[PDB]
Amino acid sequence: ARGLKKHLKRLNAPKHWMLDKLGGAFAPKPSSGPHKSRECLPLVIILRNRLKYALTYREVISILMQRQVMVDGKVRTDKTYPAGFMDVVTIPKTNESFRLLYDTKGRFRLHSLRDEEAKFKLCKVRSVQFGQKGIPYLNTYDGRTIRYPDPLIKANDTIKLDLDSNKIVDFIKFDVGNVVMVTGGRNRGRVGILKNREKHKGSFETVHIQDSQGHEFATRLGNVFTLGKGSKPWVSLPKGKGIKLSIIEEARKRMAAQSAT
Template sequence: MAKMGSRKHLKRYKAPKNWPIHPKENKWTVKPAAGPHAIEESLSLLIVVRDILGLADNSREAKRIINTGKVLVDGRARKDYKYPVGFMDVVQIPKTEETYRILPDTKGRLTLHPIPKGNDGFKLCKITDKTTIKENKTQLNLHDGRNMIVDESYSVGDVVSLNVPNQEITDNFKFEEGAMVLITGGKHTGEIGKINEVIINKSSNPNTVIVENDKKNEFLTLKDYAFVIGKDEPIISLPGGN
């Protein structure tokens, strides 16, 4: 029994720092299953339902809510309480008509940001890699584990907007100077700004970008940390009314 529990559960004090849970409330928490997001970059659906949204008082109630298909992730009912929910996923509770987007706060913790109607029918996905396959088509590898076959030209680092749950690409936001970005890592995690300059390093050092925030202050961050959220302004609802 102990070995079985160790695969599903994790001691709270060992949980990743980006999980918005208190390490001393209970001894154990639920470990996300392998899936579209890395375990250290996601939350189990049970944690979302019980600990963050407070829709259940205990694990049994949370499992019942999830098992009956009352929670949607990216427009689809997910009935596995260990299902990993991660960055940019859209979580919907049809019964209460509430919708949330998973975003990082300024401390790097994953949070559920309430989003209004009209902003809930899509999600943003970053292109992390691409390959050419048969018939000269392109396969895009997206940050949430999706693979999509397309005819059009896309670049690694760009962000596509997908309808949910249809998963059809409706727009493409290029990673370029002037683009609006959300910082997903480093000391500027959670900040919003505009790309002023992309610095391509010819050495083994990673590429970086200079970002200007709404106070006209500039900061340097890794290119991989900059997630495009719009061309001239953010197309998603953001904490703080941005």
């Protein structure tokens, strides 16, 4: 190509969007923004495919152009705005507020939030370095830059960000023993306790996570996101709570449901 691609073929879209293959030749091309195109959920999908408020591509534009949708406390009018992990979506007219969290099967879930809990979000620190004039600053994995951070904050830590004051309220150091969630790969959406950190010079760092039921799984450091200090996460989790059940166990529940339901 001679430049930037502006189209996304439907079969080339991320699988976790769950788009029907015969629905059309194209899928919403995520706009540039805080989250990567492969790790986001465009507002058009959220409003039309997840919440059913809009029935067509056109109706999504009408909803957004009325300034009825807010992401991280700010109104967004871009249909393909890349809403991602931990983002807070608020719809004042419906009095609804959701947080984008992965379900245990690795797909974004619109977790309904209370009004009190919708005033903050968690961000993962990418790096900390000195800026112009020797002023230290840190940048996160959601595109945010914070100046004059706490000196104790380091890379891979998690910071609690207040969407009103736009300031770091509290932070969690990345260390063994904290509860973390997997944000990418095969184990995406699983929650467990960080048990070990295996460092390999010049290579990716591997982290071993043990589930609450004793199941142990590994992953890369880049796919980990600390949720709380100790064993209690600082955010509300969905019903599964990051517990991945085997297909046999899942089938067992389905069989029981039919008998009762």
